[PDB]
């Protein structure tokens, strides 16, 4: 009605608006978070971060609902995700690194029973990506299947408008310069698998370790039971309720056998869902006679910096 090519120009305004919006929100969340990382000795800013992500998600929804053949789904971000997922279904000292893939992190959200709405799945997916520092990457990859975006979005869309989309992604790139735990800190009751790796000081000195070791991983939201490690096992992946940010790890043995002297260099525990990797420096003996004769030692963990950038 009285709008043939007028709407075309009206949609370019909306696209501009969505970009200026994205930038603003991006620029704010970074300032709010860098400011939180400035002086915090313990939150007030913690609830703010929840609403900030709330807004970031609606912005992303609006961006994904702009100019398309609307699915029955309530979430346009989850529907375009679901497609990329279903269209791949058709086309068919250091530990091993994890698979980086928007589909992988989708699966992680897909096996969370409590989440029922398509909207929550998307909202969950975006937080997990934010903690992982892959929101930008995942969207740039979801957007690489150009034929898919073309099949779903009209030509005047935001996503289809490649000059503004590139800036849109380049801004989400800022979330990689800050540490988010928006996935970990909200889903406090899901099961998460922790990959353990005991790094013994390999040097021929003494004799083969004969005792039975045990380990105990603890984080902010909780801790694990005492885990009895099978003799001659230095790597195992254990699943348990979300422990939050790993804090400490304690290892020891029962002093059984002839040579019950153990020298462990460090213990490495990794969140197999977020990829977060904690190093637990040890470097001391475990056994009567050596060092201060401790049969169990407490290790303080350090979050290792994200790598790589390739």
């Amino acid at each position: 009605n009285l709008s043939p090519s007028v709407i075309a120009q009206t949609n370019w305004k909306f696209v501009e608006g969505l970009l200026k919006e994205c930038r603003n929100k991006t620029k704010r969340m970074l300032v709010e978070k860098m400011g939180r990382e400035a002086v915090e000795l313990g939150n007030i800013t913690g609830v703010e971060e929840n609403t900030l992500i709330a807004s970031l998600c609606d912005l992303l929804e609006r961006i994904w609902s702009h100019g398309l053949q609307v699915k029955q789904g309530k979430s346009a971000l989850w529907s375009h995700l679901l497609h990329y997922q279903e269209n791949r279904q058709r086309k068919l000292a250091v530990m091993s690194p994890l698979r980086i893939s928007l589909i992988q992190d989708m699966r992680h959200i897909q096996n969370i029973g409590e989440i029922k709405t398509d909207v929550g799945k998307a909202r969950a997916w975006v937080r997990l990506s934010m903690e992982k520092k892959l929101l930008s990457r995942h969207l740039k990859q979801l957007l690489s299947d150009h034929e898919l975006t073309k099949k779903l979005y009209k030509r005047y869309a935001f996503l289809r408008c490649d000059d503004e989309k590139e800036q849109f992604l380049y801004h989400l790139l800022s979330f990689n310069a800050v540490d988010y735990f928006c996935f970990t800190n909200v889903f406090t009751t899901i099961l998460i698998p922790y990959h353990i790796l005991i790094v013994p000081s390999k040097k021929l000195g003494g004799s083969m370790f004969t005792a039975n070791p045990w380990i105990c991983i603890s984080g902010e939201l909780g801790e694990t039971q005492i885990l009895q490690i099978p003799r001659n096992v230095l790597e195992m992946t254990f699943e348990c309720q979300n422990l939050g940010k790993l804090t400490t790890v304690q290892i020891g043995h029962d002093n059984s056998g002839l040579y019950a002297k153990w020298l462990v260099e460090c213990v490495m525990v990794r969140n197999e869902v977020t990829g977060h990797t904690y190093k637990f420096p040890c470097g001391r003996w475990l056994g009567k006679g050596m060092d201060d004769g401790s049969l169990e030692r407490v290790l303080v963990g350090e979050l290792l910096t994200s790598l790589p950038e390739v």
Partner: protein, 166 residues
């Protein structure tokens, strides 16, 4: 036809201030921290040709250091900016140019720039010291200031003309 110009430098050397001088001919001495990347474009009017320049104002913060190589990808031109009132900012100036030619090829028009030439208070770098390392590498050189607006246009004029066109 579009032209990409990336602005690189240490925390608070004057990357964003030079953009405001050229964009809206004005200066603000209040410090505003750059968060990642800011996009801004203008159309340069020259006697021979006239095409728009897409500017990329990157952050000088370390928190954003790991993203800088990403901002250079496909960049037609790179403009390295360093303070002259500080030695450290001038120190790693070369580390920047190196990363540029490392991500981009040799066709990328690079130009060294020593900002803050308005005040001589605590100036530890001289025009000579900058001219020498600008002569070692295939990189242009020019002295500039945002507070005074010391030929900020020259910085643009010759860098936008010294490149292939439509």
């Amino acid at each position: 036809r579009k032209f990409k110009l990336v602005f690189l430098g240490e925390q608070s050397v004057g990357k964003t201030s030079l953009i405001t001088r050229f964009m809206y001919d004005s200066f603000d001495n209040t410090y505003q921290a750059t968060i990642g990347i800011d996009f801004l474009s203008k159309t340069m009017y020259l006697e021979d040709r006239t095409v728009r320049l897409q500017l990329w104002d990157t952050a000088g913060l370390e928190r954003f250091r790991s993203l800088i190589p990403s901002y250079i990808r496909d960049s037609t031109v790179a403009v390295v900016v360093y303070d002259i009132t500080n030695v450290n900012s001038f120190q790693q100036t070369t580390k920047w140019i190196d990363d540029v030619r490392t991500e981009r090829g040799s066709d990328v028009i690079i130009m060294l720039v020593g900002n803050k030439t308005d005040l001589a208070d605590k100036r530890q770098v001289s025009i000579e010291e900058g001219e020498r390392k600008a002569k070692e590498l295939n990189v242009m050189f020019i002295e500039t200031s945002a507070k005074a607006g010391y030929n900020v246009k020259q910085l643009f004029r010759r860098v936008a003309a010294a490149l292939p066109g439509m």
